[PDB]
Amino acid sequence: MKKTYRVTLTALGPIFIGGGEKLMNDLNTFVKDAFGRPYIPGSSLKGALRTAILNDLKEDTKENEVFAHLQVSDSETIDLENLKVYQKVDYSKTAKPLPLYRECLKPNTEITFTVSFDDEYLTLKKIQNALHKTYQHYYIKWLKGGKVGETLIKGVTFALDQPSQNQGEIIYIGGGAGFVSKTLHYKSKNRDQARNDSFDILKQLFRTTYSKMRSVPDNVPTGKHYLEMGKARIKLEEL
RNA sequence: ACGAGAACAUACGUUCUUUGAACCAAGCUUCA
């Protein structure tokens, strides 16, 4: 069928998709086009749908048969007045601005995408249930322990957004929203899998153990919002 | 004081006239 969609992202948090050209001043730069006008490349959305569908064992290989057909294009190109400076804060305990800043996209930015995919193995029947599955396990596998354990009253304007819509089609794109948003294997147990990836992570660095690892929300610059970043809403309409 | 003397097997004559090394064939597949 080649069912094309016009999906649109609205930003619940500050977002910074890599860039490569990146340097208390710490002046940063972002991915732009050749006209100096920012946009979001389609590989970010393809990685987000890789988190969505391929949440399984390590078969994410050149032998793959699903994601050669998922034809994600780029977006429309938005001017640079949709951009404010923001800060990095780690909400584990005693939340303080860490010295690692970024010039990033302003929240609630309307960006739209010409996303299409073939129907040989790919439908929205898969996308809907896979996104609800990944969202529900993003709470019940990692963030439920962050809700019940080592929780401070500063974070609870914050939207828990679980009674809102169970078919909300929510993804996570990689924008420095912790090293939990760049995962692939959460199936299907709670704490044995947690300690599994805990030694898998802690043989790559030197931290003393504590639960839970690293949750990175953000806020607004007195009005406060405690806006978690990395997540966005998607609509699915044809053409 | 030889069946012997003398006597170029020589002259003129394009290995030449025809015709495409063509047709068939995303540097692409998985990469936040």
Please report the beta strands in chain A, taking only residues with DSSP state E, as ranges in sequence order. 3-11, 72-75, 83-86, 102-105, 111-117, 171-172, 231-235
Q: Which technique was the structure solved with, according to the deposited record?
A: cryo-EM
Q: Does any strand B atom come closer than 7 Å to the Cβ of A18?
A: yes
Of A214, A220, A188, the C-alpha closest to A201 is A214
Spatial CB neighbours of A59, under 8 Å, sequence gap ≥ 6: none
Q: Does any strand B atom come closer than 7 Å to the Cβ of A64?
A: yes
Annotate A160-183 with DSSP letters as a single string. Answer: --TTT-TT---EE--SSSTTTTT-
Q: Which residue has the tokens 């302003």?
A: A106
Dihedrals phi, psi of A50, to nearest 5 degrees: -70, -40
Q: How far apart are CA A90 and CA A215, in angstroms?
A: 6
Of A105, A116, A108, the C-alpha closest to A7 is A116
| Angstrom distance, A138 CA to B8 C1' | 114
Q: How far apart are CA A206 and CA A197, in angstroms?
A: 15
Note the resolution in Å, 1 decimal. Answer: 3.0
Q: How far apart are CA A169 and CA A131, in angstroms?
A: 6
Query: Is the preceding omega at residue A188 within 30 degrees of 0, hence cis?
Result: yes
